[PDB]
Amino acid sequence: MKNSVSVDLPGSMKVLVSKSSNADGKYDLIATVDALELSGTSDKNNGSGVLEGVKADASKVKLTISDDLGQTTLEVFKSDGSTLVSKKVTSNGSSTEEKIIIDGIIIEKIITRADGTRLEYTGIKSDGSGKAKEVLKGYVLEGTLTAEKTTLVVKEGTVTLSKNISKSGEVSVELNDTDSSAATKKTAAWNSGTSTLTITVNSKKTKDLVFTSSNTITVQQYDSNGTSLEGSAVEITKLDEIKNALK
Alpha-carbon distance of 209 to 190, in angstroms, equals 10
Beta carbons of 119 and 129 less than 8 angstroms apart: no
Alpha-carbon distance of 196 to 204, in angstroms, equals 16
Q: How many CB atoms lie within 10 A of CB 241?
A: 15
Nearest to 131 by CA among 117, 162, 110, 112: 110
Nearest to 53 by CA among 25, 72, 74: 74
Resolution given for this structure, in angstroms: 1.9
Beta carbons of 197 and 188 less than 8 angstroms apart: yes
* Domains and their CATH numbers in the chain: 1-102 (2.40.128.160), 103-247 (3.90.930.1)
User: How far, CA to CA in Å, does 41 sit from each of 8, 28, 46, 178?
Assistant: 17, 5, 12, 63
Question: Strands, E, within 192-226: which ranges?
Answer: 196-201, 204-211, 217-221
Q: How many CB atoms lie within 10 A of CB 132?
A: 24
Q: How far is CA 201 from the centre of its chain?
A: 34
In a 13 Å sphere around the CA of 197, the CA atoms on its Cβ side amount to 23
Nearest to 211 by CA among 228, 198, 230: 198
DSSP 3-state of 243: helix
Count the residues in the chain.
247
Alpha-carbon distance of 87 to 107, in angstroms, equals 12
Q: In what order do the strands lie in the sheet with 196-201?
A: 186-191, 196-201, 204-211, 217-221, 234-235
Q: Which long-range contacts (CB under 8 A, 24 or more apart) does 194-199 make?
A: 195/171, 197/161, 197/173, 199/175, 199/245, 199/246
Compute, in degrees rounded to 10, the torsion defined by CA atoms 187, 192, 197, 198.
Answer: -70
Kindly give the pairing relationship between strand 130-135 and strand 118-122. antiparallel
DSSP 3-state of 218: strand
Provide the sign of the torsion angle of the four alpha carbons 212, 218, 222, 226, taken in this order.
Answer: positive
Alpha-carbon distance of 191 to 146, in angstroms, equals 24
Beta carbons of 122 and 108 less than 8 angstroms apart: yes
